[PDB]
Homo-oligomer: A and B are copies of this chain.
Amino acid sequence: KNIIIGAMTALITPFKNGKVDEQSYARLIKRQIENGIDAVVPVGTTGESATLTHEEHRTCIEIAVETCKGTKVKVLAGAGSNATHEAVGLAKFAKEHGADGILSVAPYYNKPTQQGLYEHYKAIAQSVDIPVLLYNVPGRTGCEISTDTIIKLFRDCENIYGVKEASGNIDKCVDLLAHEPRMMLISGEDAINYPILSNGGKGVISVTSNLLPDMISALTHFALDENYKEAKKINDELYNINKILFCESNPIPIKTAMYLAGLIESLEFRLPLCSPSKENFAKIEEVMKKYKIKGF
């Protein structure tokens, strides 16, 4: 198996005057690289994938690929869709523009059956020869990839190598690795990075690492090296920030934090996303004071 594992960041997409701030994007990626991160995920949920155009999607993947060139950092591009023909197109597109692998979210809104999910991902995996990571996030999609479906896809499709789980369900994580220990289970929920890793998970795709790349990468690496004592210490230390970064829908809080930290110049979203309430803005600002935030 070719795989992409370790500490990985779901990159925010900075905007300036309604456009992707391309210089800022490259600079943010360089900061990730210099702080121990193993891979970056351009144009996922945290990157406002829903509201980007196809050309902007291309631009972000290209910038990620170029910034990571000559480094150990890989690019796991977001490429999911709820239409199979579109997801196949996107997987091919990502590979065309130099991605090392793709993250492909379960179809949102149209609620396919397990058989549909199996055929969806089989089509995607067959369209490219790079690694594919499934992404289960039922609170956002309205559907769940069952354990049996994930395992069948892993066993049947050479390049499907694991799943990013964002379902708040540690029982499912036990189920997955007890039955198919060969897969790469990746945490998609920051607050529980340590519990997932301590049960044999092999990485994280993190929102929090946008702000604290050094701490998330340290946690992940400690855990992978079976230094559970030190990984847990960091996971506990991070709980407050990990929680507050979801006080409103991601990436509203993380972009607010990045702005407060002076890491992006404009606190700007594309509708229907918008700035947080004053109460939540103030909570985010206060929680941040307890952490050492690396600059550029």
Chain A residues within 8 Å of B, Cβ to Cβ: 45, 48, 50-51, 82-86, 107-113, 115-117, 119-120, 123, 139-142, 168-171, 173-175, 177-179, 181, 189, 191-192, 194-195, 198-200, 226, 228-229, 232, 235-237, 239, 243, 248-249, 252, 270-274, 276-277
A83 & B191 in contact (Cβ 8 Å cutoff): no
A204 to chain B, nearest CB (A): 14
Name A232's contact: one of B111, B123, B194, B200 (CB within 8 Å).
Answer: B200
Alpha-carbon gap, A243 to B179, bound state (A): 13
A246 to chain B, nearest CB (A): 10
* Known A85-B270, A177-B236; further 14 A-B contacts with Cβ < 8 A: A110-B140, A112-B249, A113-B276, A119-B271, A119-B274, A140-B142, A171-B189, A173-B195, A175-B191, A178-B236, A194-B199, A195-B199, A198-B198, A226-B228
A66 to chain B, nearest CB (A): 26
A198 to chain B, nearest CB (A): 4
Contacts of A273 in B (CB 8 A): 110, 112, 116
Alpha-carbon gap, A8 to B75, bound state (A): 47
A271 & B85 in contact (Cβ 8 Å cutoff): yes
Contacts of A107 in B (CB 8 A): 50, 272
Alpha-carbon gap, A277 to B86, bound state (A): 25
B110 & A50 in contact (Cβ 8 Å cutoff): yes
Contacts of A239 in B (CB 8 A): 174-175, 178-179
Alpha-carbon gap, A173 to B235, bound state (A): 12
Name A272's contact: one of B112, B173, B252 (CB within 8 Å).
Answer: B112
Q: Which B residue sits closest to A138, measured CB to CB? A: B142
Name A249's contact: one of B85, B86, B111 (CB within 8 Å).
Answer: B111
A136 to chain B, nearest CB (A): 13
A117 & B174 in contact (Cβ 8 Å cutoff): no
A216 to chain B, nearest CB (A): 15
A78 to chain B, nearest CB (A): 12
| Selected A-B contacts with CB under 8 Å, 30 pairs | A45-B109, A50-B109, A51-B82, A51-B86, A51-B110, A83-B270, A83-B271, A83-B272, A84-B272, A107-B272, A112-B271, A112-B274, A113-B252, A116-B271, A116-B272, A123-B271, A141-B142, A168-B169, A168-B170, A170-B170, A173-B195, A174-B194, A174-B195, A175-B191, A177-B236, A181-B236, A194-B199, A199-B232, A200-B232, A226-B229
